Design a protein around this ligand. Sequence first.
Ligand code: 9HV
Ligand code: 9HV
Lengths: 649, 649
Amino acid sequence: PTVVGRIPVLDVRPVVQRGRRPAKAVTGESFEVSATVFREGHDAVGANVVLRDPRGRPGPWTPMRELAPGTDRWGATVTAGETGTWSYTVEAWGDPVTTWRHHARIKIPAGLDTDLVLEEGARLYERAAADVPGREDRRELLAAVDALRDESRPAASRLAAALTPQVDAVLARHPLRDLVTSSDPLPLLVERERALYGAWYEFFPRSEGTPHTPHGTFRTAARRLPAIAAMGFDVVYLPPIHPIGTTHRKGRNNTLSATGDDVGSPWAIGSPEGGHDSIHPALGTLDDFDHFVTEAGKLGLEIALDFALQCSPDHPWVHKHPEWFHHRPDGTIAHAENPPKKYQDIYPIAFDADPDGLATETVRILRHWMDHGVRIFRVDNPHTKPVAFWERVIADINGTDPDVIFLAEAFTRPAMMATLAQIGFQQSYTYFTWRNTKQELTEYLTELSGEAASYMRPNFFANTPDILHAYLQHGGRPAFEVRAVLAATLSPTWGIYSGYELCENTPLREGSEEYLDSEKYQLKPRDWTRAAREGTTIAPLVTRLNTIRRENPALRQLRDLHFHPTDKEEVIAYSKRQGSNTVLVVVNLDPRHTQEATVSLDMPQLGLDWHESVPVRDELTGETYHWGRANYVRLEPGRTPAHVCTVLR
Amino acid sequence: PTVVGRIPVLDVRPVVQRGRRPAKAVTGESFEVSATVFREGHDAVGANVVLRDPRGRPGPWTPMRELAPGTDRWGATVTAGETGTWSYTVEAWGDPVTTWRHHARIKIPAGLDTDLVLEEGARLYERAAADVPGREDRRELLAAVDALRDESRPAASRLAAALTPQVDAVLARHPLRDLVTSSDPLPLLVERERALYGAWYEFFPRSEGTPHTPHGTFRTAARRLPAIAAMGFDVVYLPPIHPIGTTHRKGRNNTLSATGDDVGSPWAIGSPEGGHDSIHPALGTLDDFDHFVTEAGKLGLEIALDFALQCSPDHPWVHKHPEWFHHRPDGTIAHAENPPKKYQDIYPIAFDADPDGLATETVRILRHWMDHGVRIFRVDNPHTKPVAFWERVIADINGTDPDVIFLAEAFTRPAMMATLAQIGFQQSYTYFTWRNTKQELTEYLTELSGEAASYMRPNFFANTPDILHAYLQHGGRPAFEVRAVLAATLSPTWGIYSGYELCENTPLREGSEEYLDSEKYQLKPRDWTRAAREGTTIAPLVTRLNTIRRENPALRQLRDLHFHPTDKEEVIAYSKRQGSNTVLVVVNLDPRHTQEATVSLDMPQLGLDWHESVPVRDELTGETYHWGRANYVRLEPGRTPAHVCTVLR
Ligand SMILES: O=P(O)(O)CCN1[C@H](CO)[C@@H](O)[C@H](O[C@H]2O[C@H](CO)[C@@H](O)[C@H](O)[C@H]2O)[C@H]1CO
Ligand SMILES: O=P(O)(O)CCN1[C@H](CO)[C@@H](O)[C@H](O[C@H]2O[C@H](CO)[C@@H](O)[C@H](O)[C@H]2O)[C@H]1CO
């Protein structure tokens, strides 16, 4: 038993954990399958990819090509179909016809061995016709065989009868493959479109109240849903909707002692009113929640609930399951931390006394909300809980409900972030907010669109309730406009947290990424009507970006992305492609000064020739341009963040 | 059945073809085992490598360390023992003591819960003391436990009693390990020292003849062995010693027609007088071979026979086994080609008709020469035969005789060269002869000493009967001295083909790498006695280089190699280390012009601080120096090709 087959097929990619975890795709997504393929001697080889659906049914004939000269690295693009677990193999084989052609095109014109050479080609084409299924094809090959053996015609006439485009066609479909060798199957997990592509919007229902009842309900907060859908979003992400503890409840601006009417942080879950399977009483009943979900569904909006595996000191688990927490010698439970951040209002979970009870209760809670229409969960801080626990929980839920999507809020070191996606997490938060220079964005997006794309799907939130980057603080509305362009065009999934449209950017203090008067600790009513009428919102820009994404398949994928050089450090340029759709973006990363630059596009990367010129339409303005290998641009902050151009037919 | 453990331990290296082939070492060789190790939350982790011998007995406690901050990549050096098939795993675990220490050193000076902190540390140390085997260790830890619980003492004094170097030593030897998680075992093949370390000498026995009998015999050739051993070599590699064909026998200088007394090419194996198991009648009998082997053994020389799986047209296989060759429609057998090279005097073997008979016959021939003391085989052009054939043959032979070394003579593309080593070849010819500038040499040996060392051991032949590089053609004797210094100091295995020490460098023609009047097609008698008498040889430099290697364990390994920068393109500097032995080498790559430069050593990479001077001795002259962060060198072609220095005490 040899590790290597007759014709070596090695190091098939993509591969996750040496084959023990699946590579990932979504319905209709294209990606490259590659392998190292070669043979002994100098004769030619060929290779093809066999992608099998969940029932074992192979896909179309998919031949591979050597990706670079002298590397023996071969590749071919496949497209994922319906959801489920697929498999793919690589088949390699001797290519006797190419070998005989290449050498017959030398020996016949120079009179060497012609009768012996032409008869050798007749014997090959004969073996080729034996493995050809259709009879019209089978006679096209036997006609070339007979013409090859016709000693009464010139040798150049006999040879050329086997090198015609009509013999090219049969062989480019049913080629003669020698010593066919196969790799071992590699698994592929195909999931639904929303796992890769979608626009996300986060807001606090309790903030959308009334003058008489300032604490909003699910029934008042449902009034925001039409505006959210009108901005082109597909997913509404809600902070925890459960009762909030009173013991050590935090006050406004993250103060230790709440006073009077303070509402506390929604992530300090649990009170005598209920736990993770309960509704905050100021938000209404489980019946109102169904109404909210139903109204969201009518507008094309899916709900994503926050899942925070933690407890306030008043959560029922504290006395019903004391072994789910670590107790110090005096019996107290230390509050959760994530340094240098401290959460004096919550307890972390201990997983090693009763791991089965925790997993059983966790999937029960998730299935409760799944029964009420929640098919997406934003998982709070997964990296402070055991990695294997999430692997077990995700596999349990997806085993019965493969449509459920899990998003990992893991802002941590690279190894943990990769592993969490590799063990099941459909989506991952990223380093996006901390990549603001051209070098940072080019390097990070090269990483996310490269090998990481076989297991990680990025969700680019331009802001979060805990992340107001110094770029937005110092750049004002122009900064908000640039980050929206970048996030919406660089990832097929992007999102914002309410208030971003209004360019809220007052930090807690200098050096902090917290908002002043953070919504996490207080109701935040907003004059949405006045901002629209006074034009002080970038919702129109947000709306246009989502329209452009809904209209251009290139912005609904991740792996096809290429950066084009500019002569200005503040100006970045890149393109993305999907079939015949090509989008080109040029962004001025300077929010305070106008920048002009030449954009030297990589034309073969666009499928064009260096001399060619193409018409483009700036989808932000409707203006038409004609662009070639060198293009002048002038971008003024406030007036224009970027050009978002589509290539016209 | 989760893939990931309690404490994630991931991507264990070295790994070869995802664990389907073993990583390699030789007895006494050290290498690094690495893994990605981390845990949820912020508590500390530890890790260690468990190395098991062919019986399953684990090696010593081998703790790992994080190789670079923030990477979660851990490693530790291991050392292979006896030959056989080993295994290795990485164990990861929570390290609570480190976690508690880092917290207590902050909280006790701050007066924050010090009674609770020291009591948490007492219970931890109690858990540690139960595990330790000795009584002197258990009394030690329990003494620190009681000092922690002594409330009559100050808080800092109670804590300090747990951080004393005595308690540091107990747990550095027997650490408390929580939630021990293990990787799956990976295979490691350990082989004898000769597989990695050895100096080789190739020569044709027939050229060592007499005036009355010009064609040498095994008996006359044996008289050449003393000078070979005196030069410090360990292996003699003989071209094929079998009968040579007559049909299409090449003439002198590779002419297509041999005339009269032309001896022909030894690689054209086969005549009616016998095949691969026979001996050329002009060489003698099997008994004379045995005498040749015995005289080799007496001088400390192993025999390496060339194995060329190919035939002359007069080889008995041509008619006894016709299906071992590819026949054309007319029944003729096309001669072998490695284009644009033609060998009209041999037939290539076909493997697809009777692969079993070929494998059976190949191992039979190999075991016959093994019965006569041949434990090393130089395999001729393995890359024109199927990869799986060599995997099968090497597995069969090494199954009964693991001491047998196979050397792949595969000057081809990188993927086949790497695959051949991974499927079983103990040694590999390399691109050495085509790596002559400082950039070429630095880049190539970074590759060989890096990850490839896990599966490939390089044999640095400075010349072969087919390779006389233009650097030697144009550089004369100084160029021969440069390449011998490089080959001997840069790889633990290196070799020369006879005539190299006489600086034979006359090409067949300009731009060729063939020798003029090549020894492959004619007797090439050499006046060794006159060469030594007249000093027209570099045998002493070869002898001194080989002795330096025998007196310095650093030059007997591959993985440890660092390059140090200089001021001139033509002057290269590098160092190699093994235990206390550190060798420093400075080479003038210019064989025509004297070069002066400053060698700016990376003193940390040497185990010394930046502001320090340390004694060196050039082992080519005996002169001694004192070298530091900067050192002026002056190298003169013909008198000082290079400095070869050991570090003195
Ligand atoms: O801060 P991160 O690094 O991102 C931690 C991630 N989790 C959420 C992420 O969005 C945060 O919403 C949440 O932290 C909020 O909730 C806590 C509980 O009451 C408060 O103690 C904190 O003051 C407040 O900031 C935190 C823990 O659940
Ligand atoms: O030339 P390479 O490209 O490196 C092929 C390498 N193999 C040996 C290398 O060590 C060579 O000794 C050997 O080629 C010699 O023997 C032939 C007998 O058929 C002659 O025809 C050639 O003229 C002569 O050069 C060749 C095949 O066995």
